[model samples]
Target: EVADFELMGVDGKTYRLSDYKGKKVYLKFWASWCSICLASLPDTDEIAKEAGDDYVVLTVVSPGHKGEQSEADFKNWYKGLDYKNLPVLVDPSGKLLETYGVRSYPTQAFIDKEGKLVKTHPGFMEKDAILQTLKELA
Candidate 1:
């Protein structure tokens, strides 16, 4: 089962787990200070673009790190990368991090149509691998 969350996106929009009812949801948890996540963002963006109508890709920035990053910091760090349209969801209390049990720098959760988390992958994955999984869900 997926734990519900109420979060605001960098685009100034609110989002919830229930919003994506019939699609496959992919949540990639990242932190600004994570170098590994920096490297992963580009390829992740590529797959996100190719994900099609059946998929919902969300990049969530975890909060309450010892050296925390503000919304500006997150946006600037992301801007230095490839995509300009990626929506970075902010979780200030880090509640989603704890609820989702994301202990690593870059953790990915793939949820099926019924709101059950089918897979939780830790670390970065290449384009082909991610695409294959998306295809399966699609």
Candidate 2:
């Protein structure tokens, strides 16, 4: 089982891992300063778009932690982005990253529908691989 987490979206909405109980979750950890993460933004959005109803795709950013951009700067930076399909969750305390043992930017975690963390991959994942993994998870 994966530990539960609570994070706030840039839109002022609160998101919890437990809230997605019956759905598969694709949680991506990223940073505004990470160039590779920025390059994968569109692919991440595509994953969300193609994931269908059984899946919840979310991206996480730790503001004021690990030399990441501040919350204000992140919001401002996101304002200019074209990918708005997935919620950009704010991890102000960085506890979620620590819980998942994230050691690098652009880490992806897959949680099964039962809330079990199936796997974690550190690096950029193409859309095809992401979709294939989600299919296998189902």
Candidates' C-alpha lDDT: 0.78, 0.89
After aligning candidate 1 to the native by TM-score, how far in Å is the CA of 108 from where it should be? 1.1
Candidate 1 residue runs with Cα over 4 Å from true position: 71-82
How high is the lDDT of residue 69 in model 2?
Answer: 84
Instruction: Give the per-residue lDDT digits (tens) of candidate 1, residues 30-81.
Output: 8888889888888777767776786888889865553558766776665666
Task: Name the runs in model 2 displaced over 4 angstroms.
Answer: none
Residue 22 C-alpha lDDT in model 1: 87
lDDT of 2 by residue, 1-138 (tens): 988888889989999889999898999999988999999898898888776786889999999987898899889988888886888999889898888889998899999999898999999888888877887886
Model 2, global lDDT: 0.89
